[model samples]
Target: SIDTPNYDVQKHINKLCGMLLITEDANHKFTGLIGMLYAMSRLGREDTIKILRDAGYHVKANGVDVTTHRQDINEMKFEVLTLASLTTEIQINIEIESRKSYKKMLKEMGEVAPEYRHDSPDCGMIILCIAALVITKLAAGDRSGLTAVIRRANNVLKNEMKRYKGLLPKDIANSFYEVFEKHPHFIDVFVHFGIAQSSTRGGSRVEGIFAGLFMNAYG
Candidate 1:
């Protein structure tokens, strides 16, 4: 019972997914996710939520949080014990739990899904945007914003960055912090200093991790 009233819509979503997901790097995935936000926003603030809310929550809960928590809680728990004087096998053995669940994640919807939906490939990038955005529930431009999102993503991702181990996370962080300024609360600072500064910095910052992640995936 997947919706197919308009084959064109499905085609759009499918093409979108493949175009975005074909790559195996964070760069396109980031922009891939980031790029769609524009399309979502253009769909108007109302319809925007219709898609992003479902996709955002799904990704954060599963895609992003999955690998992250496993890394911190278990990687440390087992590795510390093993390094303490046990055996490397413990970490490797315990890591199987991570692999098990992660494999299960793949079973459900890997960052690379068998079939792309309106949300697919790397939904985590969108969640990263969410974590960094302010939750606006009224008027217009509503979203899910959790301050904890930043702390959690950063804490775990700093380690995960070991996988990337470069300026990419730094760019994402800079972009995250800078983007949050768009809320109602930051009007004064933005107005006083000029929106130009924020934009300039944010634009420049994203390129590194943007470059780091996006570059890997795009080409």
Candidate 2:
């Protein structure tokens, strides 16, 4: 392997890319990302927490098994290295795929398990719903951060699931980044949780899934 200082990030990019290339319906692709979003951030608000739980996670209190708000998500850290390396292309592909996969998922809401499967599970669904909700709110000109929700009404969300009244989908897809922007202490310490979370599951799959919704907007 080449001795690049950002070797770990490149390794991750490679791993992520491989996962996306290997399988079309790669399972548990967003499991860790879906799981860690709640496991890391210390969400104190009920609206956000309750709505997320309604999606199928209420922490381990009622056999829900939503694990603790861990800190290790912060451990597997990466510096903001140059994106032009392997990750740039890999991540862009990820975003494109992420948007595409999500577009297919939105279609799933009205089907009987259509021909293929969407990687976003129940927990992962929570992520997109929240992003859609947040997009609605942001479009309404409310960046309160404390206010968020779950809804699938038309008008607020548009095209490739982006165009949030002129903003992008990458605006607030990552819960780790969202929490830090809105509120984080030990909560913020949990920021890198997504990276750590993606490490186990298909890292590249997560990025694309992220970019799918996030990139449709971010791009």
Candidate 3:
């Protein structure tokens, strides 16, 4: 029906799908599917049978394991492939399969409808604050109690977000990460403690490849 009620919401969904390498046609089907699954998961909906059937996954049918058995082996075999070994075609197939499964689970919901828990503190902001504080303590060579540091950072984020209202945690977290990226000294503190290395120095090539994929897809 294409009943997305707002442009901003549709834009947000498009942005997320774009980050995952979903082409526009597939995004049309799976964007709402992802939102529906996310909503269902959050609400803990209990129609497992319907979900599995609708998703075209035959885990169980009439007390029988439809996934296994030699006759149905074509439908059930699984593979564990490493990211480092994935070729471009393999990566594209992986993304397509992921999108296809979600699309099957729920045809477009016709709207972007993710519930927002406005009352709770932003978890992403809290996470970054904790990381920054932990890095600060490590850089200072403070080998004291970890509980105190955690508690202090928790309070800091709570106070900082007290004024902001109805913002997504991803936006908050991404903002913080970008700022941290700018001031390498903040992240570099972790490098000095032998806990982590600067991204430029010892970063994983595999991580870089996936990040580049996202950036290219996002654009």
Clashes of each: 6, 10, 0
Estimate candidate 1's alpha-carbon lDDT, on a 0 to 1 scale: 0.31
Among all windows of 10 consecutive residues in model 3, the one with the lowest summed lDDT is: 62-71
- How do all models score by TM-score? 0.24, 0.24, 0.22
Task: Please give me the total number of clashing residue pairs in predicted model 1.
Answer: 6
Query: Which ten residues in a row are the worst by lDDT in model 2?
Result: 61-70
Error of 1 at 124 (Å): 3.9
Per-candidate Cα lDDT values, in order, are 0.31, 0.33, 0.31
**Alpha carbon deviation, residue 115, candidate 1 (Å):** 16
Give one digit per residue, the lDDT tens place, for model 3 in 51-143: 444555443322111121122322443322112212334434434554454453346544322211212222222223334444444433334
The sequence of per-residue lDDT tens digits that candidate 2 reaches over residues 76-164 is 22222232223333333443454455455557566524222322222232233334334334433345532333123232333323211
Error of 3 at 43 (Å): 35
Model 1 Cα lDDT, one tens digit per residue, 1-219: 011012123333333323322322323223322323323322333333344354432211111010112344434532211112113444233344334443544576656333232234232333333232222211233323344445544654453333221214333443434443332322222222122222223433222232233222223
Q: Report the poorest 10 consecutive residues by lDDT, candidate 1.
A: 59-68
Error of 2 at 52 (Å): 21
Q: How does residue 55 of candidate 3 score in lDDT? A: 51
